[PDB]
Amino acid sequence: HIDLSALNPELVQAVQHVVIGPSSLIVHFNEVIGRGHFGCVYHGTLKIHCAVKSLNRITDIGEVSQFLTEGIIMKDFSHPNVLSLLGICLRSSPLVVLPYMKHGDLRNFIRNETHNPTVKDLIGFGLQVAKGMKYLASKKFVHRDLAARNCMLDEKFTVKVADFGLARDMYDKEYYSVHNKTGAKLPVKWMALESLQTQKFTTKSDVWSFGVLLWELMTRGAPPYPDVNTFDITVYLLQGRRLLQPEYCPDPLYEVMLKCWHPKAEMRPSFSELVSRISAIFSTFIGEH
Ligand SMILES: COCCOc1cnc2ccn([C@H](C)c3nnc4c(F)cc(-c5cnn(C)c5)cn34)c(=O)c2c1
């Protein structure tokens, strides 16, 4: 039930634009297209193709006014490299309605044997992520879980930063480790040093994660630091170590990665700078699909 008075009065008007009437959404529960810890994702027809995420694997949604507020904030985000929220549908837990992303998550796409992106293509995927993150950062939004598994591609191969707001989940449980003091399940191999120490996330720790994501692109989806175990990553990094330069990664792109992993968070490049530097490197290449 929607209690309009429980919302901030400023936001009441925006509710009509986020809520999807059940007569407008056919959900095909016969075919799972995504699996999160908090719930499964299904085909949906809104005629446009959509992805419908359940949150029923969680025992409770939380404060319904807060859930709507998150929806309202999220729907106002609009950028070609950020996954949009189409809306929220209520059933007698609510369903989150996202655009259909035909080619799935970026990591699986670059690992796929049937597709063959060139080096220029891979750098271009990187640039598209950088633009999405420049936009999210301009809205003061900290992602906290940027990684190739958490970006998706549509039918035109447009790359979108995903896995945030009401779509946030663990879609590959392998890469999340339980903190012993806090219990939080953390993507430690994508995390900045300071975040591993404090569990505080900033746009500058998203930039660190972005550097790792660039490394994933250039290795076509290799797992980072395979011979390091979970929270021993802090010890590993503090030995004076970083991920090695992939074979087909240009020297300037590796230099970009090293700047993203700067020990001083404030000395890491902004996402605007990353878009600028990467656009330059991208422009030096010929040949792409
Ligand atoms: C091969 O892909 C077939 C298309 O299936 C789709 C098509 N479109 C979508 C759209 C959204 N989602 C959920 C809500 C979602 N939202 N963000 C993400 C994300 F960042 C990653 C994933 C994901 C799914 N599987 N994996 C490995 C990662 C799923 N994500 C989906 O799971 C989803 C699944």
Side-chain angles (χ1 to χ4, degrees), residues 73 88 96 115-116 143-144 146 151 177 183 207 214 222 224 240 258 261 269 277 286:
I73 281 288
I88 294 161
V96 190
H115 284 91
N116 193 22
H143 191 288
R144 308 175 145 243
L146 184 59
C151 294
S177 287
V207 167
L214 285 180
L258 298 178
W261 304 324
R277 288 175 175 272
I286 298 150

Coordinates of all heavy atoms in Angstrom, one line a residue, residues 73 88 96 115-116 143-144 146 151 177 183 207 214 222 224 240 258 261 269 277 286:
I73 N 14.5 8.8 -6.8 CA 15.9 9.3 -7.1 C 16.5 8.6 -8.3 O 17.1 9.3 -9.2 CB 16.8 9.0 -5.9 CG1 16.6 10.1 -4.8 CG2 18.3 9.0 -6.3 CD1 17.2 11.5 -5.2
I88 N 8.5 0.7 -10.9 CA 8.3 -0.3 -9.9 C 6.8 -0.8 -10.0 O 5.9 0.0 -10.0 CB 8.5 0.3 -8.5 CG1 9.9 0.6 -8.3 CG2 8.0 -0.7 -7.4 CD1 10.2 1.6 -7.1
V96 N 11.0 -4.7 -9.5 CA 11.8 -3.6 -10.1 C 11.8 -3.9 -11.6 O 12.1 -5.0 -12.0 CB 13.2 -3.5 -9.5 CG1 13.8 -2.2 -9.9 CG2 13.1 -3.5 -7.9
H115 N 32.1 -13.8 -29.5 CA 32.3 -12.4 -29.8 C 33.8 -12.1 -29.8 O 34.5 -12.7 -29.0 CB 31.5 -11.5 -28.8 CG 30.0 -11.5 -29.2 ND1 29.2 -12.3 -28.6 CD2 29.3 -10.6 -30.0 CE1 27.9 -12.0 -29.1 NE2 28.0 -11.0 -29.9
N116 N 34.2 -11.2 -30.6 CA 35.6 -10.9 -30.8 C 35.9 -9.4 -30.8 O 36.2 -8.8 -31.9 CB 36.2 -11.6 -32.0 CG 37.7 -11.6 -32.1 OD1 38.4 -11.4 -31.0 ND2 38.2 -11.7 -33.3
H143 N 28.9 4.5 -6.3 CA 28.5 3.2 -6.7 C 28.8 2.1 -5.7 O 27.9 1.4 -5.3 CB 29.1 2.8 -8.0 CG 28.4 1.6 -8.6 ND1 28.6 0.4 -8.1 CD2 27.6 1.5 -9.7 CE1 27.9 -0.5 -8.9 NE2 27.3 0.2 -9.8
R144 N 30.0 2.1 -5.2 CA 30.5 1.1 -4.2 C 30.8 -0.3 -4.7 O 31.5 -1.1 -4.0 CB 29.5 0.9 -3.0 CG 29.1 2.2 -2.3 CD 28.0 1.9 -1.3 NE 28.2 2.8 -0.1 CZ 28.5 2.4 1.1 NH1 28.6 1.2 1.5 NH2 28.6 3.4 2.0
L146 N 31.5 -1.0 -8.5 CA 31.9 -1.0 -9.9 C 32.8 -2.2 -10.2 O 33.8 -2.4 -9.5 CB 32.6 0.4 -10.2 CG 33.0 0.6 -11.7 CD1 31.8 0.5 -12.6 CD2 33.7 2.0 -11.8
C151 N 28.3 -4.1 -15.1 CA 28.0 -3.2 -16.2 C 27.3 -4.2 -17.2 O 27.6 -5.4 -17.2 CB 29.2 -2.6 -16.8 SG 30.1 -1.5 -15.7
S177 N 33.4 -11.2 -0.1 CA 33.9 -11.8 1.1 C 33.4 -11.2 2.4 O 33.3 -10.0 2.5 CB 35.5 -11.8 1.1 OG 36.0 -12.7 0.2
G183 N 30.6 -8.2 9.4 CA 29.7 -9.1 8.7 C 29.4 -8.8 7.2 O 28.8 -9.6 6.5
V207 N 36.8 5.2 -8.4 CA 37.9 5.4 -9.4 C 38.9 4.2 -9.3 O 39.3 3.7 -10.4 CB 38.6 6.7 -9.3 CG1 39.9 6.8 -10.1 CG2 37.7 7.9 -9.7
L214 N 39.2 -1.6 -15.9 CA 40.0 -1.4 -17.1 C 40.9 -2.6 -17.3 O 41.1 -3.1 -18.5 CB 40.8 -0.1 -17.1 CG 40.2 1.2 -17.3 CD1 41.2 2.3 -17.1 CD2 39.5 1.4 -18.6
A222 N 39.7 -11.8 -17.2 CA 40.5 -12.6 -16.2 C 40.2 -12.1 -14.8 O 39.9 -11.0 -14.6 CB 42.0 -12.4 -16.5
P224 N 41.0 -10.8 -11.2 CA 42.2 -10.1 -10.7 C 42.7 -10.8 -9.5 O 42.0 -11.4 -8.7 CB 41.6 -8.8 -10.3 CG 40.2 -9.0 -10.0 CD 39.7 -10.1 -10.9
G240 N 53.8 -3.2 -2.1 CA 54.2 -2.4 -3.2 C 53.8 -3.0 -4.5 O 54.6 -2.9 -5.5
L258 N 47.4 2.8 -13.1 CA 48.2 3.2 -12.0 C 47.8 4.5 -11.3 O 47.9 4.6 -10.0 CB 49.7 3.3 -12.4 CG 50.3 2.0 -12.9 CD1 51.8 2.2 -13.3 CD2 50.2 0.9 -11.9
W261 N 44.9 3.7 -9.1 CA 45.3 3.0 -7.9 C 46.3 3.8 -7.0 O 47.0 3.2 -6.2 CB 45.9 1.7 -8.2 CG 45.0 0.8 -9.1 CD1 43.6 0.7 -9.0 CD2 45.4 -0.1 -10.1 NE1 43.1 -0.2 -9.9 CE2 44.1 -0.7 -10.6 CE3 46.6 -0.5 -10.7 CZ2 44.1 -1.6 -11.7 CZ3 46.6 -1.4 -11.8 CH2 45.4 -1.9 -12.2
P269 N 42.6 10.4 -10.4 CA 41.9 11.3 -11.4 C 40.4 11.2 -11.2 O 39.9 10.2 -10.8 CB 42.3 10.6 -12.7 CG 42.7 9.2 -12.4 CD 43.3 9.3 -11.1
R277 N 41.4 11.4 -20.9 CA 42.6 10.6 -21.2 C 42.3 9.4 -22.0 O 43.0 9.1 -23.0 CB 43.3 10.2 -19.9 CG 44.0 11.3 -19.2 CD 44.5 10.8 -17.8 NE 45.3 11.8 -17.1 CZ 46.6 12.0 -17.3 NH1 47.4 11.3 -18.2 NH2 47.2 13.0 -16.5
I286 N 42.8 2.3 -34.9 CA 41.9 1.9 -36.0 C 41.4 0.5 -35.9 O 42.1 -0.4 -35.3 CB 42.8 2.0 -37.3 CG1 43.3 3.4 -37.6 CG2 41.9 1.5 -38.5 CD1 44.7 3.4 -38.3

